[PDB]
Ligand binder design. Sequence first.
Ligand SMILES: C=CC(C)(C)OC[C@H]1O[C@H](O[C@@H]2C3=C([C@H](C)COC(C)=O)C[C@H](O)[C@]3(C)/C=C3/[C@@H](COC)CC[C@H]3[C@@H](C)[C@H]2O)[C@H](O)[C@@H](OC(C)=O)[C@@H]1O
Ligand SMILES: C=CC(C)(C)OC[C@H]1O[C@H](O[C@@H]2C3=C([C@H](C)COC(C)=O)C[C@H](O)[C@]3(C)/C=C3/[C@@H](COC)CC[C@H]3[C@@H](C)[C@H]2O)[C@H](O)[C@@H](OC(C)=O)[C@@H]1O
Ligand SMILES: [Cl-]
Ligand SMILES: [Cl-]
Ligand SMILES: [Mg+2]
Ligand SMILES: [Mg+2]
Ligand SMILES: [Mg+2]
Ligand SMILES: [Mg+2]
Lengths: 236, 236
Amino acid sequence: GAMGSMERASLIQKAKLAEQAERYEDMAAFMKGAVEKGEELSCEERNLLSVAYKNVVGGQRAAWRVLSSIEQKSNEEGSEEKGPEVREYREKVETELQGVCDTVLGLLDSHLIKEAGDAESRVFYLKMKGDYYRYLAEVATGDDKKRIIDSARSAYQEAMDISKKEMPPTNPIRLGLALNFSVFHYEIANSPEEAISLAKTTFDEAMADLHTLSEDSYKDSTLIMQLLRDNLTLWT
Amino acid sequence: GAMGSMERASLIQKAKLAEQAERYEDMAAFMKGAVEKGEELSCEERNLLSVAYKNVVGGQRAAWRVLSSIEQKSNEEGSEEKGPEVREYREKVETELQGVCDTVLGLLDSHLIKEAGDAESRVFYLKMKGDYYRYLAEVATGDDKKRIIDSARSAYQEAMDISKKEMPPTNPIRLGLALNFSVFHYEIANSPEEAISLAKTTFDEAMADLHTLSEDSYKDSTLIMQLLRDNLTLWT
Ligand SMILES: C=CC(C)(C)OC[C@H]1O[C@H](O[C@@H]2C3=C([C@H](C)COC(C)=O)C[C@H](O)[C@]3(C)/C=C3/[C@@H](COC)CC[C@H]3[C@@H](C)[C@H]2O)[C@H](O)[C@@H](OC(C)=O)[C@@H]1O
Ligand SMILES: C=CC(C)(C)OC[C@H]1O[C@H](O[C@@H]2C3=C([C@H](C)COC(C)=O)C[C@H](O)[C@]3(C)/C=C3/[C@@H](COC)CC[C@H]3[C@@H](C)[C@H]2O)[C@H](O)[C@@H](OC(C)=O)[C@@H]1O
Ligand SMILES: [Cl-]
Ligand SMILES: [Cl-]
Ligand SMILES: [Mg+2]
Ligand SMILES: [Mg+2]
Ligand SMILES: [Mg+2]
Ligand SMILES: [Mg+2]
């Protein structure tokens, strides 16, 4: 660990600076170093961890999709052989993306999830585990696609069960989990009906719980409810 | 050179793919590898080289400016001591930025400039040399600031002399060189009057040469003339 010699508090401070500078690779490395100090993460610290890797892998996924599209076009009828370069470079990006997902999943397994006892931390980390197996599933094609998909489903499902028992329907973590599990059903598991049912029931049950909330609360929950509505509008 | 085993043509192909995927670090590494094959670069290849490093260093500069601003605020009256972290992380970004500039300058010196005989290639590379010394000047503070500034001025000046002798006033490379030399005068050399004079004469002399051009030509020259006008509007 190249961050082993830096104070935990300094790593957190620098992660916040990297966020302000949109240096997300740095941000992720600082937060990895903070996790590796062995102490549990606070609510604010968990958000820094997830934002950093979301942006790193997000850029890798966007690049992979561009290259995969070029590759597919190059393998159609009437296309001129370009050689191995497109496949090679797509494989390079894919392998780097898989490495980042493996790193995140290793942090969750060593040892964030096992030490997370409160619902808000346990559901948060299990959602992340589902998210990063989902990203692996987006690029998987070999004899492991089915196992990767089931690993994502299993993590999302355990997070769902906890969130329904321990969190109100408007809790932003519960809402973001349901949004992403719904995307998993639609895009990964070939289950659009399940995706639509989950997004609708999640939206409706949150709607009916809004009356319990303060005003300047739940800006993140309003945002996420709109994303559920956006997906239902695209899917129906 | 980690690109030593890849074919030149494959490096160029992958640089174009990286551009489409907005993977500019990859793009720069592929183009560095292509330069290191020892053959001169075509017009299209020179553009790939400059776009790749422009985007890499551009992101580093934007991050450095964010951090430097935070650092300055932290060193004002009434500010709470945050410790060494802001300076440390600004120094980290600064050192990475300087390393990229050094790499580009080394490619120009080994051996792009010495083998560039045509005006369009020689002016192009000398403009790049001025640009990357300018980026070094933006962060320089020690006993080398003056020498760095003069290295930028010297490269821009030699490019200017060639461009005025060998290129029409509407040539896009000549125009972009004048635009950037004007920015050097304004932002680096504390010479706003020189910056304004250069931008105005460049604009006026290009205006008077437009009548020689074809229509679907010079989209890049129209774009650059507008940037000269934009700067004159900001500066006056
Ligand atoms: C990374 C730190 C920063 C940028 C400072 O904060 C990110 C954000 O962190 C919190 O928001 C979380 C959160 C996001 C909110 C939906 C953003 O809301 C607004 C108004 O922008 C998106 C972020 O990625 C983050 C951290 C992700 C999670 C997601 C994590 O799964 C493992 C589950 C849902 C969502 C929850 C955790 C949100 O509470 C806060 O409630 C947000 O504050 C506001 C104005 O709403 C803040 O923007
Ligand atoms: C990197 C390759 C790609 C993205 C394919 O092309 C970049 C661009 O490459 C060319 O444009 C150059 C060029 C740019 C043009 C001003 C862009 O014009 C338009 C319409 O977008 C900006 C680029 O950074 C680039 C390569 C940089 C230079 C600069 C280099 O200094 C060392 C000097 C001025 C300018 C010259 C070289 C331009 O000719 C072409 O003339 C442009 O084609 C069009 C539509 O105008 C193309 O967009
Ligand atoms: Cl590759
Ligand atoms: Cl640092
Ligand atoms: Mg300590
Ligand atoms: Mg615990
Ligand atoms: Mg060869
Ligand atoms: Mg030559």
